Symmetry: C3
């Protein structure tokens, strides 16, 4: 980053409301507002050092919770039945998530920071591991930025949940749109029973923390295909159409029967006039 | 590299013919020449910056195509039905693949290069994801070298395709031979329905782009076992017999029922007299 | 490491006895002493450069062997039937494992060292790939330290073997205990038929060789969840309770039906008084 926007230093205390609700079709979703729950749940993005107090309200008729990966939380914000941190029907509970910068410990070793592509989901609906909650749609992305991380034009969330993308019916996307040159960020999460392989036509990224190479010294494999299993999360940024131009670029699971059965979407990269060649 | 051979700078325009054909036993393969199709298809190796024009002819009675991972291609060389870039029976089409070196963008960020271990396969036989084509043998390796990359004595391709290695019958290899000290390159690709774990006796490599460490600063895990799923590709170089001597060194999938059912081969490392201890 | 303990330079010749024995319940385990076999087998830890002569005795009524990952061994210590290096019932055989430091080769390239998290297991019980042996419990961890590697307070071994952790009945752990601040090392190995995803509540590590970052330049993804398949091994160190405090922190496979069916344990992090909040 030299003219691209980059993340500032963190350290703010932030407050926020979340709700779990039952949707009309039988699914379950999180939202920042009652009546506006989505699957996947809304993106939460913070900077290393930020603290997040989430006033969580369960509007459903069964117990539910909020469990996060990667971020610092005390055992009281575990989101599990065992540690008494789930939420009764109609109830409200404040979960606290903290994040930290990396740095030297007293023993001379290097403490990793919280930065990365993470996620949150339910841990008590259906089973004490949230199997029913997760299947129904109680999951969502969390991004933690390091000071200096490159910021994108837009962020899209792709979740392989059992045999669905984002709980959608087979062969219904989702599709995403960009213009040639856009800096597009993808957050890729997997849930459920199955392993998958995420693949994008026409684009590639680094298999490291940020999905991008800092410079010529980073030996990370550059890839366009990645095996994932339940609760894996990673993310990356690509320049839409870079070196390849506009087009209807497929992304899909590359497990042959999964793509055949509907785990396919389109990354629609447009020319400025909005047209897509071959579409 | 200081006395080992290394890749030169790229930037040549290269031309090439390929064919897809039906084989007598019902399989399908690619070749550089009619009558000389193989499974896996022939290796394509280029240097970062090279352009490749492939005059592709489909000699089969069903539509077929050429789809590549990792390399730059415009949407017209997608190799998909949707983007009208497959090929009618008897037809001919010119696919263009480009590659680029890494470098700084105008925004100050670092663009990754095309270098890596990649692959090509069919995308329209049987299904619009090439399920039948891939099952029948329409796949092959592509290597893109960075300026300065270490070159091997020989390159072998190992493809785990469903429950087969290189579409072979159970317990029929393939086997590869080397002499103690040879620099051997492996390109490892997976296709089909199943996850696998690739394992080599007596040898190990780095889990990064090239499979080798540049020096003492590379923190990449050194491994001898790697989980893979459909359309994953990686590669590496080993010094045959280094620190372990000659021998019939097994490689196999480490999923227990897969090795039991025939996903096993031999890396035959010979003494100069050509003998193998214990073989 | 500056006040933390670190590994010394290696290069010692070490001797050791091992036994394979049948256990009263029908399982099979390795031990350093007859009558003290365990599943997992005892940890073997050496420094880069060490040589290890293992006088192995098979006390069982069927042929058995010792096969190691990662370490240097000549073909006579392969532990396979093919290379005549298994052991008859009642027999004794000396296996030799060597290890080496990294360094420059004559050709100018960088030879990787043996350092890493590895493992050993049987290769001839039940099948010529040790399927019965492995299922019955013939597996164990091996750690090879690089000069300067940070040493932990304690090392725990977690093995996902088919649908079990360490061959235990569903929902019986194992559990591990630590005090807030302890440097805890985990060695994580997978065996059998299935892919898994290892997950720890409240803690995270680097996806590289040592599981820790050297400093600010290491671009490795920091994770709390990792997909694994048969014969994969990795390890890492965490500071128990760092930034999160005491508590009954779950670890489990994150494949939903696996956690539901019993692949769960507890990392019990205590305050100095020995108490755990919420437990
Ligand atoms: Cl989205
Ligand atoms: Cl080959
Ligand atoms: Cl243990
Ligand atoms: Cu959990
Ligand atoms: Cu899939
Ligand atoms: Cu593709
Ligand atoms: Cu989770
Ligand atoms: Cu595709
Ligand atoms: Cu396999
Ligand atoms: Cu082995
Ligand atoms: Cu593909
Ligand atoms: Cu083996
Ligand atoms: Cu599992
Ligand atoms: Cu968790
Ligand atoms: Cu093994
Ligand atoms: Na934000
Ligand atoms: Na070439
Ligand atoms: Na020791």
């Amino acid at each position: 980053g030299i003219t691209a926007r980059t993340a500032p230093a963190g350290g703010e205390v932030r407050h926020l409301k979340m709700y779990a609700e039952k949707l009309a079709d039988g699914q379950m979703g999180y939202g920042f507002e009652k009546g506006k729950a989505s699957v996947p749940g809304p993106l939460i993005e913070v900077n290393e050092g930020d603290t997040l107090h989430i006033e969580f309200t369960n509007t459903m008729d069964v117990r539910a919770s909020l469990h996060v990966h990667g971020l610092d939380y005390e055992i009281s914000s575990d989101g599990t039945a065992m540690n008494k941190s789930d939420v009764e029907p109609g109830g409200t509970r404040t979960y606290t998530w903290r994040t930290h910068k990396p740095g030297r410990r007293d023993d001379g070793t290097w403490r990793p920071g919280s930065a990365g592509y993470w996620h949150y989901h339910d841990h008590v609906v259906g089973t004490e591991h949230g199997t029913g909650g997760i299947r129904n749609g109680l999951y969502g992305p969390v991004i933690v930025r390091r000071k200096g991380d490159v910021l994108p034009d837009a962020t899209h969330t792709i979740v392989f949940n059992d045999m669905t993308i984002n709980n959608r019916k087979p062969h219904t996307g989702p599709d995403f749109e960009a213009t040639v040159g856009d800096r597009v960020e993808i957050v890729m999460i997997t849930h459920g029973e199955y392993y998958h392989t995420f693949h994008m036509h026409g684009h590639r990224w680094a298999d490291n923390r940020t999905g991008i190479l800092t410079g010529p010294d980073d030996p990370s494999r550059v890839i366009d295909n990645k095996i994932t299993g339940p609760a894996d999360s990673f993310g990356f940024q690509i320049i839409a159409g870079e070196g390849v131009g506009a087009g209807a670029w497929m992304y899909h699971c590359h497990v042959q029967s999964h793509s055949d059965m509907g785990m396919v979407g389109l990354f629609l990269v447009k020319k400025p006039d909005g047209t897509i060649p071959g579409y």
